[PDB]
Amino acid sequence: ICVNENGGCEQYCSDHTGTKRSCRCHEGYSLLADGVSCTPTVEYPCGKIPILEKR
Amino acid sequence: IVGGKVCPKGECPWQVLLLVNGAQLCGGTLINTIWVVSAAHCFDKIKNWRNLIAVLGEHDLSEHDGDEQSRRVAQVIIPSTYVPGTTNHDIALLRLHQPVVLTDHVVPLCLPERTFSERTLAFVRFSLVSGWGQLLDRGATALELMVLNVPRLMTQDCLQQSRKVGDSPNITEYMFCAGYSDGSKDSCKGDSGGPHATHYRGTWYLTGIVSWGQGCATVGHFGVYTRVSQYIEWLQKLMRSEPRPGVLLRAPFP
Numbered sequence: 171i172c173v174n175e176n177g178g179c180e181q182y183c184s185d186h187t188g189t190k191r192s193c194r195c196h197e198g199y200s201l202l203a204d205g206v207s208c209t210p211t212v213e214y215p216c217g218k219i220p221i222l223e224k225r
Numbered sequence: 226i227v228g229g230k231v232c233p234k235g236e237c238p239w240q241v242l243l244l245v246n247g248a249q250l251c252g253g254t255l256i257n258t259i260w261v262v263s264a265a266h267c268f269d270k271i272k273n274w275r276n277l278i279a280v281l282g283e284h285d286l287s288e289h290d291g292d293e294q295s296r297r298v299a300q301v302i303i304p305s306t307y308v309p310g311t312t313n314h315d316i317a318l319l320r321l322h323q324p325v326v327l328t329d330h331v332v333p334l335c336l337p338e339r340t341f342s343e344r345t346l347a348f349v350r351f352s353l354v355s356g357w358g359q360l361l362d363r364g365a366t367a368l369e370l371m372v373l374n375v376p377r378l379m380t381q382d383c384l385q386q387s388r389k390v391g392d393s394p395n396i397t398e399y400m401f402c403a404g405y406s407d408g409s410k411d412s413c414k415g416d417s418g419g420p421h422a423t424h425y426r427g428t429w430y431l432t433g434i435v436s437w438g439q440g441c442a443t444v445g446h447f448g449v450y451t452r453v454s455q456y457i458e459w460l461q462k463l464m465r466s467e468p469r470p471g472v473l474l475r476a477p478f479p
């Protein structure tokens with residue numbers, strides 16, 4: 171599943187027991203209930219440009 | 226950077242400027258508050274290891290605006306497989322003496338997981354390369370941070386689209402080509418160690434390090450970047466390790 175289109179994950183993808191898939195996030199982020207999206211948990215998460223984000 | 230543009234202040238907030246005795250040495254990428262990823266070749270001629278400074282929040286080299294944060298480089302970790310004066314395994318992991326403070330102008334770039342980097346990031350065509358390097362081949366270096374968007378190439382295509390040269394190094398699985406063969410756009414020597422940053426679903430990730438090439442934006446030649454995805458586990462294991470006495474550390478690779 172992870173092999174194709176990142177298994178639908180916004181960030182990291184882990185394959186499981188055949189048809190199972192888990193999305194994960196980098197630290198400073200938490201996974202939303204959709205099970206794919208990552209939302210920042212900190213003021214300055216990695217890979218995001220504050221001047222652009224606050225615009 | 227040849228044929229790019231000024232990176233607007235705060236738009237490359239992970240960009241690092243490495244200094245030795247106050248002079249421009251290389252670039253680098255901030256990956257969290259204490260760690261910087263750069264190129265191993267930046268340290269080939271270093272004799273005074275105690276005068277290595279990393280500057281975060283830097284933009285314009287002619288003026289101090291108050292967003293700059295300087296830190297001494299406490300440790301430079303290079304893979305055992307890297308040989309000085311050669312091209313393969315061109316990566317260095319730098320431990321800052323004190324953490325930097327994250328602000329609107331100082332933000333780490335995500336060091337991605339290997340699988341995500343190989344399966345997804347390696348297929349994003351364009352990525353940004355940045356630094357205060359040469360604005361032209363045999364030209365002056367930039368006073369303001371420059372950024373360039375470059376397309377990534379499969380190694381077979383890079384070798385097929387390049388002009389053949391004698392004693393030119395092989396492109397290993399620890400490298401990748403990116404850029405243009407028309408001589409208009411490239412990263413150059415003064416940009417060495419700097420980030421090759423890839424955007425994916427609203428977030429930027431570290432995919433490459435400015436490593437080597439021919440001349441500077443030379444017709445028939447692409448930029449060669451260290452393939453960071455080969456080093457994820459190596460980097461992660463070292464970031465969990467206790468500091469060791471002495472600046473330079475050679476660590477087993479793999």
Ligand SMILES: CCOc1cc([C@@H](Nc2ccc3c(N)nccc3c2)C(=O)NCc2ccccc2S(=O)(=O)C(C)C)ccc1OC(C)C
Pocket residue numbers: 250251266267268269270310311312313315394411412413414415416417435436437438439440441442443447448449
């Ligand atoms: C593994 C690194 O090998 C090389 C690095 C470079 C320079 N860097 C770059 C980087 C990106 C480039 C690009 N995209 N397009 C065109 C040219 C480019 C040149 C460089 O840093 N020169 C200076 C240098 C070179 C080697 C050790 C210390 C130094 S240094 O001490 O000056 C240090 C301050 C960088 C040139 C040739 C190299 O190898 C040959 C065998 C092909």
Ligand SMILES: [Ca+2]
Pocket residue numbers: 283284285286287288289290293
């Ligand atoms: Ca400045």
